[PDB]
């Protein structure tokens, strides 16, 4: 059981733009404090995919790390631009949220935002006047995903799904016969230059390395940035120690150490199988959307 789930790779910024009032606990997320945009992701069995890759980036972290661009416009308040993509997707929102965010068909981060002192309804399709104690200060993640930087081009990858006629907002072909319809929890991936790519099967492998996002460092725990640590035969502001993998690359001072650095288990470069070929995605996730299959 991992004690450094809140010790985030990259910057660890979990806030959406224009909701700035829990920055002290969300910018960055770390061991202490509560974050309405992040904490829900760590509750048991609520976000299974992200919990198996918890040392990879959240959607919000990926936005603030410039891995994912913000949609244009970035919010929408509740009728036309949103709610097309939002209405094909079936989601439950806890009470007291003013905002909720998702990866859209273009691979950008979109959000739905309620007016001041309004909250999202349980299905996140409407806003209603504040019932309850207090609006939360963050945004609710509507998808189960994780992200990483990638240069791998996917300008040629398009959703391919056997017998599927429509999945979400994407119509894959013309079906003239009658269709069966269902809300399905569907795996998807997003690549450099690709649109959202829905998949029949999610198939992933991790390749481990010794890059900075493969370690977590800590001084009651406090977060420590590993960029302060000098690599072997190189310069750095602080003194560090760690496991053997760390000491294989950075300088290790068992007596004068400020921080310790362990390997972040599960970290590494993630790859996904797309039509038989292994490709490195920007984000991978699950989404509950309308799917239409031929009969």
């Amino acid at each position, epitope marked *: 059981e991992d004690p450094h789930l809140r010790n985030r790779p990259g910057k660890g910024h979990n806030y959406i733009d224009g909701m*700035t*009032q*829990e920055d*002290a606990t969300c*910018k*960055p997320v770390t061991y202490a404090g509560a974050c309405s945009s992040f904490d829900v992701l760590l509750e048991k069995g609520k976000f299974p995919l992200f919990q198996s890759y918890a040392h990879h980036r959240t959607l919000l972290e990926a936005v603030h790390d410039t891995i994912i661009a913000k949609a244009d416009p970035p919010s929408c308040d509740l009728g036309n631009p949103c709610m097309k993509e939002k209405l094909v997707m079936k989601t439950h929102c806890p009470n007291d949220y003013q905002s909720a965010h998702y990866l859209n068909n273009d691979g950008k981060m979109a959000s739905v935002k309620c007016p*001041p002192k309004y909250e999202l309804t349980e299905d996140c399709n409407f806003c209603r006047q504040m019932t309850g104690a*207090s609006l939360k*200060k963050g945004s609710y993640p509507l998808q189960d995903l994780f992200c990483q930087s990638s240069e791998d081009d996917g300008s040629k990858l398009k959703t391919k799904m056997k017998g599927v006629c429509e999945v979400g907002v994407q119509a894959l072909k013309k079906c003239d016969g009658q269709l069966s319809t269902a809300h399905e929890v569907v795996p998807f991936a997003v690549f450099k230059n690709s649109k959202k790519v829905y998949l029949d099967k999610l198939d992933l492998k991790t390749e481990e390395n010794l890059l900075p996002d493969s370690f977590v460092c800590f001084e009651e725990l406090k977060s420590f940035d590993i960029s302060q640590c000098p690599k072997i035969g190189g310069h750095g502001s602080k003194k560090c120690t760690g496991d053997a993998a760390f000491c294989s690359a950075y300088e290790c001072t068992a007596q004068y150490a400020n921080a310790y650095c362990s390997h972040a288990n599960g970290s590494g470069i993630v790859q996904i199988q797309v039509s038989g070929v292994w490709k490195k995605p920007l984000c991978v996730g699950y989404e509950r959307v309308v799917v239409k299959r031929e009969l």
Partner: antibody
Amino acid sequence: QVQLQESGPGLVKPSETLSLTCTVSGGSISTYYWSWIRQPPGKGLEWIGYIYYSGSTNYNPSLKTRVTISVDTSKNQFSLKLSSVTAADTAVYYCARSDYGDLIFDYWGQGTLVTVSS
Amino acid sequence: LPVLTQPPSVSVSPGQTASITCSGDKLGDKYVCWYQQKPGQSPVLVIYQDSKRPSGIPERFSGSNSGNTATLTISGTQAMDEADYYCQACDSSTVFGGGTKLTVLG
């Protein structure tokens, strides 16, 4: 249970820099917002800025060019610097704590009077 | 930069109902806090989030906010309640009101 205690000189010459320190007791800097607020004799309240443990800040835009707020978690205090000071800066300076960045001030210090005079 | 306007000087006879107003454009979209200050001491939070009361504050204190106007009301005002009252936009772009001195007559 927290107590906030402002300390600093009571006299600052014009154009010089004003400096204050708030010491938190019976509590910690932790994840709260720590704010400086001032009140000119006989006048209303004005918010100067806040800081939180990471060192990130946010200043009143009327004052941002002359304000520095800094934090010292190891000593459980935080500080205000207000530069090129003027007679308009004569005031009681308060430190205050809030839970979130909406700045609901539920704990206040006692206030220090700083007079600007030659 | 925002400005909230209160009246200086509200007057009320004991046991009656004092009402402090605080105005600004679309103030009803922001959450409002109220503070009471008595001679020589620090402000004390009396109302937060337009209408909530901190633990330990007499229930005769209530508040409301709608349109361009927030209101702090004391029912059955005592001599105890002679003080200055400040409203604040305890929301994104924070600002205080100019303050209201409350004199309780008789």
